[PDB]
Design an enzyme around this catalytic site. Structure first.
Site, mmCIF file in Angstrom:
data_model
loop_
_atom_site.group_PDB
_atom_site.id
_atom_site.type_symbol
_atom_site.label_atom_id
_atom_site.label_comp_id
_atom_site.label_asym_id
_atom_site.label_seq_id
_atom_site.Cartn_x
_atom_site.Cartn_y
_atom_site.Cartn_z
ATOM 1 N N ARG A 1 39.399 57.696 12.382
ATOM 2 C CA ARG A 1 38.436 57.028 11.482
ATOM 3 C C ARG A 1 38.627 57.533 10.033
ATOM 4 O O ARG A 1 38.837 58.756 9.880
ATOM 5 C CB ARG A 1 36.978 57.296 11.940
ATOM 6 C CG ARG A 1 36.813 56.854 13.392
ATOM 7 C CD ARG A 1 35.472 57.124 13.922
ATOM 8 N NE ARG A 1 35.168 58.535 13.924
ATOM 9 C CZ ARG A 1 33.942 58.950 14.262
ATOM 10 N NH1 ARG A 1 32.980 58.067 14.598
ATOM 11 N NH2 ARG A 1 33.679 60.256 14.266
ATOM 12 N N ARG B 1 33.969 56.244 9.205
ATOM 13 C CA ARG B 1 32.805 57.094 9.574
ATOM 14 C C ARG B 1 32.224 57.518 8.206
ATOM 15 O O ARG B 1 33.014 58.065 7.418
ATOM 16 C CB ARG B 1 33.289 58.335 10.320
ATOM 17 C CG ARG B 1 32.310 59.458 10.531
ATOM 18 C CD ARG B 1 31.223 59.028 11.454
ATOM 19 N NE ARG B 1 30.359 60.118 11.852
ATOM 20 C CZ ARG B 1 29.340 60.615 11.117
ATOM 21 N NH1 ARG B 1 28.982 60.233 9.908
ATOM 22 N NH2 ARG B 1 28.630 61.589 11.729
ATOM 23 N N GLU C 1 22.236 58.422 17.114
ATOM 24 C CA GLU C 1 23.164 57.511 17.781
ATOM 25 C C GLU C 1 22.372 56.596 18.712
ATOM 26 O O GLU C 1 21.282 56.950 19.160
ATOM 27 C CB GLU C 1 24.248 58.196 18.598
ATOM 28 C CG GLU C 1 25.011 59.424 18.175
ATOM 29 C CD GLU C 1 26.470 59.405 17.857
ATOM 30 O OE1 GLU C 1 27.331 58.692 18.364
ATOM 31 O OE2 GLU C 1 26.803 60.258 16.988
ATOM 32 N N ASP D 1 24.701 62.239 9.278
ATOM 33 C CA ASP D 1 24.571 62.245 10.755
ATOM 34 C C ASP D 1 23.355 61.337 11.042
ATOM 35 O O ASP D 1 22.239 61.705 10.613
ATOM 36 C CB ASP D 1 24.432 63.621 11.358
ATOM 37 C CG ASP D 1 25.657 64.512 11.433
ATOM 38 O OD1 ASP D 1 26.824 64.055 11.387
ATOM 39 O OD2 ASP D 1 25.409 65.754 11.570
ATOM 40 N N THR D 2 23.601 60.255 11.690
ATOM 41 C CA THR D 2 22.504 59.349 12.057
ATOM 42 C C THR D 2 22.272 59.508 13.568
ATOM 43 O O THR D 2 23.234 59.839 14.263
ATOM 44 C CB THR D 2 22.923 57.870 11.793
ATOM 45 O OG1 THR D 2 24.208 57.737 12.486
ATOM 46 C CG2 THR D 2 23.010 57.464 10.336
ATOM 47 N N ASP E 1 26.319 55.084 11.456
ATOM 48 C CA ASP E 1 27.326 55.904 10.814
ATOM 49 C C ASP E 1 28.760 55.384 10.794
ATOM 50 O O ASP E 1 29.619 56.076 10.207
ATOM 51 C CB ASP E 1 27.273 57.320 11.513
ATOM 52 C CG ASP E 1 27.905 57.411 12.866
ATOM 53 O OD1 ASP E 1 28.317 56.371 13.450
ATOM 54 O OD2 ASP E 1 28.066 58.523 13.466
#
EC number: 3.1.31.1
Length: 136
Positions: free
Chosen positions: A82, A30, A38, A35-36, A16
């Site tokens: 970010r 970002r 982590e 939403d990946t 991400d």
């Protein structure tokens, strides 16, 4: 209207997050609306598909001849500094590719950045119907 701007890859960080040279300086981006899993937090450690999502994003930006960033109409940076954007590698949106491949879920909108939410939602649905990776 949103507009794509050139950027140069510095380094892929996670599924991400990518560091790019944007308008002369290094910046961490970002990916919007995704939403990946982590591969980093000391909380949970390395979630399943974390490494795959990471490799996925990294491969995509590393092999691209052109990387483009597209800011949305809402806030452009998070509280961590970010940049919040859609990233394109040779015209393909990385945000969407992750979702379509079952390597990320679509995130809740963040402060008006929703231009491609529907498009991403469709891709997610398809990945779900195919029981791909995360949806497996």
């Amino acid at each position: 209207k949103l507009h794509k701007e050139p950027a140069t890859l510095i380094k892929a960080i996670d599924g991400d997050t990518v560091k790019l040279m944007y308008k002369g300086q290094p910046m961490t981006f970002r990916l919007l609306l995704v939403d990946t899993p982590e591969t980093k937090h000391p909380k949970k450690g390395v979630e399943k598909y974390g490494p795959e999502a990471s490799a996925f994003t990294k491969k995509m930006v590393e092999n691209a001849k052109k990387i483009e960033v597209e800011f949305d109409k809402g806030q452009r940076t998070d509280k961590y500094g970010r940049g919040l954007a859609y990233i394109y590698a040779d015209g393909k949106m990385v945000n969407e590719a992750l979702v379509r491949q079952g390597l990320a879920k679509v995130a809740y909108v963040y402060k008006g950045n929703n231009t491609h939410e529907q498009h991403l939602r469709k891709s997610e649905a398809q990945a779900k119907k195919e029981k791909l990776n995360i949806w497996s």
